Amino acid sequence: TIEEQAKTFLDKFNHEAEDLFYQSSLASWNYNTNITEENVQN
């Protein structure tokens, strides 16, 4: 019971975490590609 809902919580968390981490990594890569204050803010 508790294991099932924990697994469901993890599955729900996985996609959102993947998307947000992809966005953050893309922002970091952009800041490491060029150097602008706008990239720092992003």
From Swiss-Prot:
It comes from the Eukaryota. Glycans are attached at N34. An engeneered stable, dimeric and secreted receptor with combined mutations that increase the affinity for human coronavirus SARS-CoV-2 spike protein shows potent SARS-CoV and SARS-CoV-2 neutralization in vitro. It is found in: Cell membrane; Cytoplasm; Cell projection, Cilium; Apical cell membrane. Proteolytic cleavage by ADAM17 generates a secreted form. Also cleaved by serine proteases: TMPRSS2, TMPRSS11D and HPN/TMPRSS1. Essential counter-regulatory carboxypeptidase of the renin-angiotensin hormone system that is a critical regulator of blood volume, systemic vascular resistance, and thus cardiovascular homeostasis. Converts angiotensin I to angiotensin 1-9, a nine-amino acid peptide with anti-hypertrophic effects in cardiomyocytes, and angiotensin II to angiotensin 1-7, which then acts as a beneficial vasodilator and anti-proliferation agent, counterbalancing the actions of the vasoconstrictor angiotensin II. (Microbial infection) Acts as a receptor for human coronaviruses SARS-CoV and SARS-CoV-2, as well as human coronavirus NL63/HCoV-NL63. Residues 11-22 are annotated as: Interaction with SARS-CoV spike glycoprotein. This is Angiotensin-converting enzyme 2. Belongs to the peptidase M2 family. Homodimer. Interacts with the catalytically active form of TMPRSS2. Interacts with SLC6A19; this interaction is essential for expression and function of SLC6A19 in intestine. Interacts with ITGA5:ITGB1. Interacts (via PDZ-binding motif) with NHERF1 (via PDZ domains); the interaction may enhance ACE2 membrane residence. The chain holds residues 20 to 61 of 805 of the full protein. Changing D19A: No effect on interaction with SARS-CoV spike glycoprotein. Expressed in endothelial cells from small and large arteries, and in arterial smooth muscle cells (at protein level). Expressed in enterocytes of the small intestine, Leydig cells and Sertoli cells (at protein level). Expressed in the renal proximal tubule and the small intestine (at protein level). Expressed in heart, kidney, testis, and gastrointestinal system (at protein level). In lung, expressed at low levels in some alveolar type 2 cells, the expression seems to be individual-specific (at protein level). Expressed in nasal epithelial cells (at protein level). The extracellular region of the ACE2 enzyme is composed of two domains. The first is a zinc metallopeptidase domain (residues 19-611). The second domain is located at the C-terminus (residues 612-740) and is 48% identical to human collectrin. Changing A6V: Increases slightly the interaction with RBD domain of SARS-CoV-2 spike protein. Induction: Up-regulated in failing heart. Expression is induced by IFNA and IFNG. Exposure to cigarette smoke increases expression in lungs. Expression is decreased in nasal and bronchial epithelium of individuals with allergy after allergen challenge. IL13 stimulation decreases expression in nasal and bronchial epithelium.
